């Protein structure tokens, strides 16, 4: 089992504090300020808000060539991806509003803000390799060079684009 474009997925991270551990999924709504946040899972109470389609997977080189010119494929490590929030129709985006930027939903995909390069968690996954289901991914914003990051804010968990990694688990569902 490899991750394929058009695959419907959820993104999960593990959150640990004070000897208590839980898994969270990346969530969004297409109403309000469209900012991302995280659901606790028991299986998320509300699955629809956590659902994403892997629309596109392009090499950084191909994506930059494409943007420069304007002025069911398997996922490979090092490639840039586009994540469509399935319910809203919009796209997971690195936003220009506050170290960390916010992560949220955007309509247009022209530009780099909506693109995320996938990186290996360990030293035994390699650039250009097929991404397995079960692999822990690292996601980096093409526009801002920041990671999709798990953050412990006030007494809760948040998601932003920051200078430190978070391992994400992308499973079909």
UniProtKB/Swiss-Prot annotation:
Residue span, MIR domain: 72-121, 128-173
Location in or out of the cell: Sarcoplasmic reticulum membrane
Post-translation changes: Channel activity is modulated by phosphorylation. Phosphorylation is increased in failing heart, leading to calcium leaks and increased cytoplasmic Ca(2+) levels.
Source superkingdom: Eukaryota
Phenotype caused by lack of the gene: Embryonically lethal. Embryos die at about 10 dpc, due to defects in heart tube development. Cardiac myotubes display enlarged rough endoplasmic reticulum and cytoplasmic vesicles that contain high levels of Ca(2+).
Tissue specificity remark: Highly expressed in heart, lung, cerebellum and brain. Detected at lower levels in adrenal gland, stomach, thymus, esophagus and ovary.
Function: Cytosolic calcium-activated calcium channel that mediates the release of Ca(2+) from the sarcoplasmic reticulum into the cytosol and thereby plays a key role in triggering cardiac muscle contraction. Aberrant channel activation can lead to cardiac arrhythmia. In cardiac myocytes, calcium release is triggered by increased Ca(2+) cytosolic levels due to activation of the L-type calcium channel CACNA1C. The calcium channel activity is modulated by formation of heterotetramers with RYR3. Required for cellular calcium ion homeostasis. Required for embryonic heart development.
Protein family (similarity comment): Belongs to the ryanodine receptor (TC 1.A.3.1) family. RYR2 subfamily.
Domain remark in the UniProt entry: The calcium release channel activity resides in the C-terminal region while the remaining part of the protein resides in the cytoplasm.
Record's protein name: Ryanodine receptor 2
Organism: Mus musculus
Gene that encodes it: Ryr2
